[PDB]
Coordinates of C-alpha atoms in Angstrom, one line a residue:
Chain A
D48 CA 71.4 38.3 56.4
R49 CA 71.1 36.1 59.1
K50 CA 71.2 37.0 62.5
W51 CA 72.0 33.1 64.4
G52 CA 75.0 31.5 63.9
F53 CA 77.5 30.0 66.0
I54 CA 81.1 31.4 66.3
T55 CA 84.4 29.7 67.8
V56 CA 87.3 31.7 68.5
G57 CA 90.7 30.0 69.3
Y58 CA 94.5 30.2 70.0
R59 CA 97.7 27.9 69.8
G60 CA 100.1 27.6 72.3
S61 CA 103.7 27.4 73.0
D62 CA 106.9 37.3 83.2
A63 CA 106.6 33.8 81.0
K64 CA 104.5 32.6 83.8
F65 CA 101.3 33.9 82.2
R66 CA 99.4 33.0 79.7
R67 CA 100.4 33.0 76.0
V68 CA 98.6 34.2 72.8
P69 CA 100.1 34.8 70.0
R70 CA 96.7 35.4 67.9
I71 CA 93.5 34.8 67.6
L72 CA 92.0 32.6 65.2
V73 CA 88.4 33.0 64.5
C74 CA 85.9 30.6 62.4
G75 CA 81.9 30.2 61.2
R76 CA 80.0 32.3 58.9
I77 CA 81.3 35.3 57.4
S78 CA 79.0 37.4 57.8
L79 CA 78.9 36.5 61.2
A80 CA 82.2 37.0 62.2
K81 CA 82.5 40.5 60.6
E82 CA 79.2 41.7 62.1
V83 CA 81.0 41.2 65.4
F84 CA 84.5 42.1 65.3
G85 CA 84.7 44.6 62.3
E86 CA 88.1 46.4 61.0
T87 CA 89.4 44.4 63.9
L88 CA 89.2 41.5 61.5
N89 CA 92.2 40.5 59.7
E90 CA 91.2 38.4 56.2
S91 CA 94.6 38.6 54.0
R92 CA 94.7 34.6 55.2
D93 CA 91.0 34.1 53.0
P94 CA 90.3 36.6 50.7
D95 CA 87.9 37.4 48.8
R96 CA 84.4 35.2 50.7
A97 CA 80.9 35.4 50.0
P98 CA 79.4 36.5 52.9
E99 CA 77.2 33.8 53.6
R100 CA 80.2 31.0 53.2
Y101 CA 82.3 29.6 55.9
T102 CA 85.6 30.2 56.7
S103 CA 88.4 28.3 59.5
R104 CA 90.9 31.0 58.2
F105 CA 90.4 34.5 59.9
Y106 CA 92.0 36.4 62.7
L107 CA 92.3 39.0 65.2
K108 CA 94.3 42.6 65.2
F109 CA 94.6 42.3 69.1
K110 CA 95.8 40.0 71.4
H111 CA 93.9 39.6 74.3
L112 CA 91.5 37.0 74.3
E113 CA 88.9 38.9 77.4
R114 CA 88.2 41.6 74.6
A115 CA 86.7 39.3 72.1
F116 CA 85.0 38.0 74.5
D117 CA 83.3 41.9 75.2
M118 CA 83.0 42.3 72.3
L119 CA 80.7 38.8 71.4
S120 CA 78.8 39.4 74.7
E121 CA 78.0 42.4 72.9
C122 CA 76.0 41.1 70.1
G123 CA 74.8 38.9 72.1
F124 CA 76.6 35.9 72.0
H125 CA 76.9 33.1 75.3
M126 CA 80.1 30.9 75.5
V127 CA 78.5 27.6 75.5
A128 CA 81.4 25.0 75.6
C129 CA 85.2 25.2 75.5
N130 CA 87.9 23.2 74.6
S131 CA 91.7 21.9 74.7
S132 CA 93.7 19.4 72.3
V133 CA 97.1 18.2 71.4
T134 CA 98.7 17.4 68.2
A135 CA 101.9 15.6 67.3
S136 CA 103.5 15.5 64.5
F137 CA 107.1 13.8 64.1
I138 CA 110.0 16.1 63.0
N139 CA 111.3 15.2 60.5
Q140 CA 110.5 11.7 57.7
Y141 CA 112.7 9.6 59.7
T142 CA 113.4 10.1 62.9
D143 CA 110.4 9.5 66.4
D144 CA 110.9 12.8 67.7
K145 CA 107.8 15.4 67.2
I146 CA 106.9 18.4 67.7
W147 CA 103.9 19.4 70.4
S148 CA 100.8 22.1 70.0
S149 CA 98.2 22.3 71.3
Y150 CA 94.7 24.3 70.3
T151 CA 92.1 25.8 72.8
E152 CA 88.5 26.8 71.2
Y153 CA 86.0 28.3 73.0
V154 CA 82.1 28.3 71.2
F155 CA 79.8 30.8 71.0
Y156 CA 76.0 31.2 70.0
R157 CA 73.4 33.8 69.5
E158 CA 70.0 32.6 69.0
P159 CA 67.4 34.1 66.2
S160 CA 65.8 37.5 66.8
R161 CA 62.3 38.2 67.9
Chain B
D9 CA 83.6 52.0 82.7
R10 CA 81.3 49.7 81.9
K11 CA 80.3 46.9 84.2
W12 CA 79.3 43.7 81.7
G13 CA 82.6 41.7 81.0
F14 CA 85.1 38.4 80.8
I15 CA 86.9 37.1 83.8
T16 CA 89.5 34.4 83.2
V17 CA 91.3 32.7 86.9
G18 CA 94.2 30.2 86.1
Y19 CA 96.8 28.8 87.5
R20 CA 100.0 26.7 86.6
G21 CA 100.1 23.1 86.9
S22 CA 102.1 22.3 90.4
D23 CA 101.6 17.6 101.0
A24 CA 101.8 15.8 97.4
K25 CA 98.0 14.3 96.4
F26 CA 96.3 17.2 97.0
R27 CA 95.9 20.4 94.4
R28 CA 99.3 22.0 94.5
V29 CA 98.3 26.2 92.8
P30 CA 101.4 28.1 93.5
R31 CA 100.0 31.1 92.7
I32 CA 96.5 32.8 90.7
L33 CA 96.4 34.7 87.4
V34 CA 93.6 36.9 86.8
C35 CA 92.7 38.6 83.1
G36 CA 90.4 40.5 81.5
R37 CA 89.7 44.2 81.7
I38 CA 91.8 46.3 84.5
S39 CA 88.6 47.7 85.6
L40 CA 86.8 44.8 86.7
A41 CA 89.4 43.2 88.4
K42 CA 90.7 45.9 90.8
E43 CA 86.4 45.7 91.2
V44 CA 86.5 42.3 92.2
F45 CA 89.4 42.1 94.3
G46 CA 90.7 45.1 95.8
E47 CA 93.4 45.4 97.6
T48 CA 94.1 41.6 97.1
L49 CA 95.3 42.0 93.5
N50 CA 98.8 42.7 92.7
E51 CA 99.4 44.4 89.7
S52 CA 103.6 44.4 90.2
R53 CA 103.9 42.4 86.5
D54 CA 101.4 45.3 84.7
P55 CA 101.5 48.4 86.6
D56 CA 100.5 52.1 85.3
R57 CA 97.8 50.8 83.2
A58 CA 94.5 52.9 82.0
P59 CA 91.6 51.6 83.2
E60 CA 90.0 50.6 80.4
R61 CA 92.7 48.7 79.2
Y62 CA 92.7 44.7 78.7
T63 CA 95.5 42.5 80.7
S64 CA 96.7 39.1 81.3
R65 CA 99.5 39.8 83.9
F66 CA 97.7 40.3 87.4
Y67 CA 97.6 37.7 90.1
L68 CA 96.1 37.9 93.7
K69 CA 98.0 37.7 96.6
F70 CA 96.5 34.6 98.4
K71 CA 96.5 30.8 96.8
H72 CA 93.3 29.0 97.8
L73 CA 90.8 28.9 94.1
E74 CA 87.6 28.9 95.8
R75 CA 87.9 31.9 97.7
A76 CA 88.8 33.9 94.2
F77 CA 85.7 31.9 93.0
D78 CA 83.3 33.1 95.7
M79 CA 84.6 36.9 95.5
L80 CA 84.0 36.5 92.3
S81 CA 80.3 35.5 93.1
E82 CA 79.2 38.3 95.6
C83 CA 79.7 40.7 92.5
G84 CA 77.8 39.0 90.6
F85 CA 79.5 37.0 87.9
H86 CA 79.2 33.0 86.5
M87 CA 81.8 30.6 86.0
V88 CA 80.8 29.6 82.7
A89 CA 83.9 27.5 81.3
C90 CA 87.3 26.1 82.1
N91 CA 89.5 24.1 80.5
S92 CA 93.1 22.5 81.1
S93 CA 96.0 23.0 78.4
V94 CA 99.0 21.1 78.6
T95 CA 102.1 22.4 76.0
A96 CA 105.7 21.9 75.9
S97 CA 108.9 23.7 75.0
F98 CA 112.3 22.4 74.1
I99 CA 114.7 22.7 77.1
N100 CA 118.4 23.9 74.6
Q101 CA 118.0 23.7 71.2
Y102 CA 121.2 20.7 70.6
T103 CA 118.1 18.7 72.1
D104 CA 114.5 17.0 72.0
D105 CA 114.2 16.9 76.2
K106 CA 111.1 19.4 76.3
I107 CA 110.0 20.4 80.0
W108 CA 105.9 20.3 80.4
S109 CA 103.5 22.8 82.3
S110 CA 100.0 22.5 82.3
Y111 CA 97.5 25.4 82.8
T112 CA 94.1 25.5 84.2
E113 CA 91.7 28.3 84.2
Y114 CA 88.2 29.3 84.6
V115 CA 86.3 31.9 82.9
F116 CA 83.7 34.1 84.7
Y117 CA 81.1 36.5 82.7
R118 CA 78.4 39.2 84.5
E119 CA 75.5 40.4 82.8
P120 CA 74.7 44.0 82.0
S121 CA 73.4 45.9 85.2
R122 CA 69.6 46.5 85.3
Chain C
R26 CA 77.3 32.5 105.0
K27 CA 75.3 29.6 102.9
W28 CA 76.6 30.3 99.6
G29 CA 79.6 28.8 97.8
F30 CA 81.7 26.7 95.7
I31 CA 83.4 23.6 96.8
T32 CA 85.2 21.5 94.8
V33 CA 86.0 17.5 94.7
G34 CA 88.5 16.2 92.8
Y35 CA 90.7 12.8 92.7
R36 CA 94.2 11.9 91.2
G37 CA 94.8 9.3 88.2
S38 CA 95.5 5.8 88.6
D39 CA 89.0 -4.6 87.5
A40 CA 91.5 -3.2 85.1
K41 CA 89.1 -1.2 82.8
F42 CA 86.9 0.6 85.5
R43 CA 88.0 4.0 87.1
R44 CA 89.9 4.2 89.8
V45 CA 89.4 6.2 92.2
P46 CA 91.9 6.3 95.4
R47 CA 90.6 8.9 97.5
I48 CA 88.2 12.2 97.1
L49 CA 89.4 15.3 98.0
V50 CA 87.4 18.5 99.0
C51 CA 88.7 22.0 98.5
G52 CA 86.9 25.0 99.4
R53 CA 85.1 26.3 102.7
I54 CA 85.3 24.7 105.8
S55 CA 82.2 25.5 107.0
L56 CA 80.5 24.6 103.4
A57 CA 82.9 21.3 103.8
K58 CA 82.2 20.3 107.4
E59 CA 77.5 21.0 106.8
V60 CA 77.8 18.7 103.5
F61 CA 79.5 15.4 104.0
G62 CA 80.0 15.6 108.1
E63 CA 81.5 12.6 109.5
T64 CA 82.1 11.5 106.3
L65 CA 84.6 14.1 106.2
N66 CA 88.7 13.0 107.0
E67 CA 90.3 16.8 108.6
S68 CA 93.2 14.7 109.7
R69 CA 95.2 16.9 107.0
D70 CA 94.4 19.8 108.1
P71 CA 93.0 20.0 111.7
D72 CA 92.0 22.5 113.8
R73 CA 91.0 24.7 111.5
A74 CA 88.5 27.9 111.5
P75 CA 85.5 27.6 109.9
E76 CA 85.5 30.8 108.1
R77 CA 88.7 29.8 106.3
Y78 CA 89.5 27.3 103.2
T79 CA 91.2 24.8 102.5
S80 CA 92.1 22.2 99.9
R81 CA 93.0 19.1 102.3
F82 CA 90.1 17.6 103.3
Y83 CA 89.3 13.8 101.8
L84 CA 86.2 11.8 102.3
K85 CA 86.1 8.2 104.1
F86 CA 84.4 6.3 100.5
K87 CA 85.7 6.2 97.3
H88 CA 82.7 6.2 94.5
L89 CA 82.5 9.9 93.4
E90 CA 78.5 9.9 92.7
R91 CA 77.6 9.3 96.6
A92 CA 79.6 12.7 97.1
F93 CA 77.8 14.4 93.9
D94 CA 74.7 13.3 95.6
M95 CA 75.6 14.0 98.4
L96 CA 76.4 17.8 97.3
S97 CA 72.9 17.8 96.0
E98 CA 71.0 17.2 99.1
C99 CA 72.4 20.4 100.2
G100 CA 71.1 22.5 97.3
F101 CA 74.5 22.4 95.0
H102 CA 75.1 21.9 91.5
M103 CA 77.6 20.8 89.3
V104 CA 78.6 23.7 87.1
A105 CA 81.8 22.7 85.1
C106 CA 84.6 19.7 85.3
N107 CA 88.1 19.4 84.1
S108 CA 91.0 16.8 83.9
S109 CA 94.7 17.8 84.2
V110 CA 98.2 16.3 84.2
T111 CA 101.2 17.0 85.3
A112 CA 104.7 15.4 84.7
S113 CA 107.7 16.3 87.4
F114 CA 111.8 14.4 86.6
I115 CA 112.5 11.2 88.6
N116 CA 116.0 12.7 89.5
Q117 CA 118.7 16.0 89.3
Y118 CA 120.0 14.6 85.4
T119 CA 117.4 12.9 84.1
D120 CA 114.8 13.7 82.0
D121 CA 112.7 11.1 82.9
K122 CA 109.5 11.8 84.2
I123 CA 106.5 10.5 86.4
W124 CA 103.2 11.8 84.6
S125 CA 100.6 11.9 86.8
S126 CA 96.2 13.3 86.4
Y127 CA 94.0 15.3 88.0
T128 CA 90.6 15.3 87.2
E129 CA 88.1 18.2 89.0
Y130 CA 84.6 19.1 89.8
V131 CA 82.8 22.5 90.7
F132 CA 80.1 22.8 92.8
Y133 CA 78.1 26.6 93.6
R134 CA 75.2 27.0 95.9
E135 CA 73.6 30.3 95.1
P136 CA 72.0 32.0 98.5
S137 CA 69.0 31.3 100.6
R138 CA 66.4 32.4 99.5
Chain D
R276 CA 60.9 9.8 67.3
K277 CA 61.3 13.4 67.4
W278 CA 64.0 13.9 70.8
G279 CA 67.2 12.8 71.0
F280 CA 71.4 13.1 70.6
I281 CA 73.6 13.8 67.7
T282 CA 77.6 13.4 68.4
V283 CA 79.5 15.7 65.9
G284 CA 83.5 15.6 65.6
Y285 CA 86.4 15.3 63.5
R286 CA 90.2 13.2 64.5
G287 CA 93.0 15.7 64.3
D288 CA 98.1 27.8 55.8
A289 CA 99.6 26.2 58.9
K290 CA 98.6 28.1 62.3
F291 CA 94.5 27.4 61.7
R292 CA 92.7 24.1 62.7
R293 CA 92.7 21.1 60.5
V294 CA 89.6 19.7 59.8
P295 CA 90.0 16.3 57.7
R296 CA 86.6 14.9 57.8
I297 CA 83.1 15.9 60.0
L298 CA 81.9 11.7 61.8
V299 CA 78.2 12.0 62.9
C300 CA 77.0 9.4 65.8
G301 CA 73.6 9.4 67.0
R302 CA 70.5 6.9 65.8
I303 CA 70.3 7.3 62.0
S304 CA 67.2 8.1 61.4
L305 CA 67.7 11.6 63.4
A306 CA 70.8 12.3 61.5
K307 CA 69.1 11.9 58.1
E308 CA 66.8 14.4 59.1
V309 CA 68.9 17.1 60.2
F310 CA 71.9 17.0 57.6
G311 CA 69.7 15.4 54.8
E312 CA 71.9 14.5 51.2
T313 CA 75.1 16.4 53.1
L314 CA 75.1 12.8 54.8
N315 CA 77.3 10.2 53.3
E316 CA 76.3 7.1 54.8
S317 CA 78.7 4.4 52.6
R318 CA 80.6 3.3 55.3
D319 CA 78.0 1.8 56.8
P320 CA 74.7 1.4 54.0
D321 CA 71.4 -0.2 54.1
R322 CA 70.5 0.2 58.4
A323 CA 67.4 -0.1 59.8
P324 CA 66.4 4.0 60.7
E325 CA 65.8 3.6 64.1
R326 CA 69.2 2.1 64.5
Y327 CA 72.1 3.5 65.6
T328 CA 75.3 4.5 63.8
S329 CA 79.0 5.8 64.6
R330 CA 80.3 6.1 61.5
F331 CA 78.5 8.8 59.1
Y332 CA 80.2 11.6 57.8
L333 CA 79.5 14.9 56.1
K334 CA 79.9 15.8 52.2
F335 CA 81.1 19.6 53.6
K336 CA 84.6 20.4 56.2
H337 CA 83.5 22.8 57.9
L338 CA 82.1 22.2 61.3
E339 CA 80.0 25.8 62.6
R340 CA 77.8 24.8 59.3
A341 CA 77.0 21.2 60.7
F342 CA 76.7 23.4 64.1
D343 CA 74.4 25.5 62.7
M344 CA 72.3 22.8 61.3
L345 CA 71.9 21.4 64.4
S346 CA 70.4 24.6 65.2
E347 CA 67.4 24.9 62.9
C348 CA 66.3 21.5 63.6
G349 CA 66.0 22.8 67.2
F350 CA 69.5 21.0 69.1
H351 CA 71.4 22.6 71.8
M352 CA 75.0 22.3 71.8
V353 CA 75.2 20.4 75.5
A354 CA 78.9 19.2 76.0
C355 CA 82.3 19.2 74.1
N356 CA 85.7 17.1 74.6
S357 CA 88.9 16.3 73.4
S358 CA 91.2 13.5 74.2
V359 CA 94.1 11.4 72.9
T360 CA 95.1 8.2 71.7
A361 CA 98.2 6.1 71.4
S362 CA 99.2 3.0 69.7
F363 CA 102.5 1.2 69.8
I364 CA 104.1 1.5 65.8
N365 CA 104.5 -2.1 65.7
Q366 CA 105.4 -5.1 67.5
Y367 CA 108.5 -5.2 68.8
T368 CA 109.1 -1.5 69.4
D369 CA 108.4 1.4 72.2
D370 CA 107.5 4.4 69.6
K371 CA 104.1 5.0 68.7
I372 CA 101.7 7.7 66.7
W373 CA 99.1 10.4 68.9
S374 CA 96.1 10.7 67.3
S375 CA 93.3 13.7 69.1
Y376 CA 89.3 13.6 68.6
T377 CA 87.4 16.6 69.5
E378 CA 83.4 16.0 70.2
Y379 CA 80.7 18.3 69.9
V380 CA 77.3 16.9 71.6
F381 CA 74.2 18.1 70.7
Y382 CA 70.2 17.3 71.8
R383 CA 67.1 18.0 71.1
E384 CA 64.0 18.1 73.9
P385 CA 60.8 16.3 73.2
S386 CA 58.0 17.7 70.9
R387 CA 54.9 19.6 72.2
Chain E
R1 CA 64.9 8.6 96.3
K2 CA 64.5 9.3 92.2
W3 CA 66.6 12.0 92.0
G4 CA 70.8 11.1 91.5
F5 CA 74.0 12.0 89.5
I6 CA 74.5 8.9 86.7
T7 CA 78.4 8.5 84.7
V8 CA 78.6 6.7 81.5
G9 CA 82.2 6.0 80.5
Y10 CA 84.4 4.2 78.4
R11 CA 88.0 3.5 77.5
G12 CA 90.2 4.5 75.0
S13 CA 90.9 2.4 72.1
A14 CA 89.5 2.9 61.4
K15 CA 89.3 6.5 61.0
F16 CA 85.8 6.6 63.1
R17 CA 85.2 6.3 67.3
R18 CA 85.6 3.1 69.2
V19 CA 84.0 2.5 72.0
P20 CA 85.4 -1.0 74.0
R21 CA 82.8 -0.9 76.7
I22 CA 80.4 1.7 78.4
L23 CA 80.7 2.0 81.3
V24 CA 78.1 2.5 84.3
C25 CA 78.8 4.1 87.8
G26 CA 75.7 5.9 90.3
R27 CA 74.0 4.1 92.6
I28 CA 73.0 0.8 91.6
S29 CA 68.8 1.2 92.2
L30 CA 69.4 4.3 89.6
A31 CA 71.2 2.4 87.2
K32 CA 68.3 -0.5 86.8
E33 CA 65.6 1.6 86.8
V34 CA 67.7 3.8 83.8
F35 CA 68.6 0.9 81.8
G36 CA 67.5 -2.2 82.4
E37 CA 67.6 -5.6 80.5
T38 CA 71.1 -4.0 78.8
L39 CA 72.6 -3.1 82.3
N40 CA 76.0 -6.0 82.9
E41 CA 75.9 -6.4 86.9
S42 CA 78.5 -9.6 86.8
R43 CA 81.5 -7.9 87.9
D44 CA 80.1 -6.3 91.0
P45 CA 77.6 -9.5 91.7
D46 CA 75.3 -9.2 95.2
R47 CA 75.1 -6.1 96.1
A48 CA 72.2 -3.6 97.3
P49 CA 70.1 -1.5 95.5
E50 CA 70.5 1.6 97.7
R51 CA 74.6 1.0 97.5
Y52 CA 77.2 2.9 94.8
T53 CA 78.6 0.9 92.0
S54 CA 82.0 1.9 89.7
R55 CA 81.9 -1.4 88.1
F56 CA 78.6 -2.4 85.8
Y57 CA 78.6 -2.2 81.8
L58 CA 76.0 -1.9 79.2
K59 CA 75.5 -4.7 77.1
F60 CA 75.8 -2.4 73.5
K61 CA 78.4 0.2 72.6
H62 CA 76.8 3.2 71.0
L63 CA 77.2 6.0 73.5
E64 CA 74.2 8.3 71.8
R65 CA 71.9 5.2 72.5
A66 CA 72.7 5.3 76.5
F67 CA 72.8 8.8 76.1
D68 CA 68.9 8.6 75.0
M69 CA 67.8 5.9 77.3
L70 CA 68.5 8.5 80.4
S71 CA 67.5 11.2 79.0
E72 CA 64.0 9.0 78.4
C73 CA 64.2 8.6 82.4
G74 CA 64.5 12.5 83.4
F75 CA 68.0 12.7 82.9
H76 CA 70.0 15.4 81.9
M77 CA 73.7 15.8 80.6
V78 CA 75.5 18.5 83.3
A79 CA 79.2 17.4 82.3
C80 CA 82.0 15.6 80.6
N81 CA 85.4 15.2 80.6
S82 CA 88.8 13.2 79.1
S83 CA 91.5 12.3 81.0
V84 CA 95.0 9.8 80.2
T85 CA 96.8 7.9 82.7
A86 CA 100.4 6.2 82.2
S87 CA 102.2 3.2 83.7
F88 CA 105.7 1.8 83.3
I89 CA 105.7 -1.4 81.4
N90 CA 107.7 -3.1 84.3
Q91 CA 110.1 -2.4 87.2
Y92 CA 113.1 -1.5 85.6
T93 CA 111.9 0.6 82.2
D94 CA 110.7 4.0 82.1
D95 CA 108.8 2.8 78.4
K96 CA 105.2 3.3 79.7
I97 CA 101.4 2.4 78.4
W98 CA 98.9 5.5 78.3
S99 CA 95.3 5.0 78.3
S100 CA 92.3 7.4 78.3
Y101 CA 88.9 7.7 79.6
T102 CA 86.5 10.1 78.5
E103 CA 83.1 10.2 81.3
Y104 CA 79.6 11.8 80.5
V105 CA 77.9 12.6 83.9
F106 CA 73.7 13.2 84.3
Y107 CA 72.0 13.9 86.6
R108 CA 67.9 13.9 87.5
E109 CA 66.8 16.5 90.0
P110 CA 63.8 15.4 92.3
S111 CA 60.4 14.4 91.7
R112 CA 57.3 16.5 91.8

């Protein structure tokens, strides 16, 4: 029943001119993630895990990022850092053509209770 | 309606060397954006929405970013993070040529009222 | 008004070091004038009102830390920074592109006490 | 001493983030105090505790667990960044492989 | 005086972090106080102490040691970023060489 810790939320990239969030991913200790998001948390891609373990494969059942930010704020978490990365993998075995994907994550933290 | 929450302002990437902002996008809870920007807020790309819901399709009528930063500062928001992401997409269906777009966003936050 | 945001940046591109060709200044004009004074070059956006906003001012020197120090003297703090990259086609019938990068630093001053 | 910086990072069933290995950089004595047995020192062994290393790595793969361990010892995350680098495939080609590196910077202030 | 900004950085490029050289930018009198004998000034000689440089560099290669020396003198890390820049290989080609640059911004407030 640990209260403090880090939680990361992110999304992969790739009308029309706006931001496109296909899915909001959640990473951190499972008990922390459950306390914040509750039933809006989809655990199907990593089911039946001990609450004190860590995961990088949860995701949310809604699409707007600011709603996830607000829910983290309601539970005492603060955004401390964020960054965006790019990854390139070859299309097939015998080509130089690649597929590019971006990953943007936001780091949240909650300090120990009083 | 609550007063705390997150607000994100951003623009798509690119009188030649200077910064080129074609449009200022606004994301977050709908009631917060209307309270901050008011008559300068354009909702045409997502109209007739409940004030307690979330959007990512509003935009501002002016184009200077620092003005939007100041209006958020008046209402009690503070900038907590910013990031820039790049993303690509194939032009045609039978080609590897791509088009690259850049996106820069600035995250703001306001605490609950006293 | 004494509070507000000021953004300084430069465009990407004696070989390994950091190459800064020009320091751009963005924000409310009265704030930019108060901070940088006569080091400010207003030729690309002249005869503007002090209460208006600009994104086309630039400085007469090139070392960024000197601009950082001047902002700090007038009560500004650096709150964020980011770097972006953009690409445009070289001509109309080609897929070749030119890549330019941009690094900016965000400063803010709170209202007078 | 007790204060100092520590950096953790990584080089980057398919939508999620792939963290192959968590790297640790900083003064050796600080890294051992924070991570202990979970610290793999095989690629840079038998070094003075007051020296600095860039080649330690952890025996687990979840980032937020490393973040939590740093938070237990009094460290705070003060910055994070991601970079990309490209190196030519061979001598007579323009092709190249791209690799990204995400970084998280931690710091603990001197004790009381 | 004693306050001011100082930036440290390096140019991009096993499976670890490769720092070829650590660059130091800021007011020259500040850089001397922080890094002292570890500071190499050969690429910007005969400068006035109250002037600014972007061409100093350090004699060691581990970033965290430079981080610790700065915080030991009262400096705090306030921001950091990475950038990528491309240039054409020659005049009649679209082939390009890519380089990355990561920097960390430090600051110290006026004395008491």
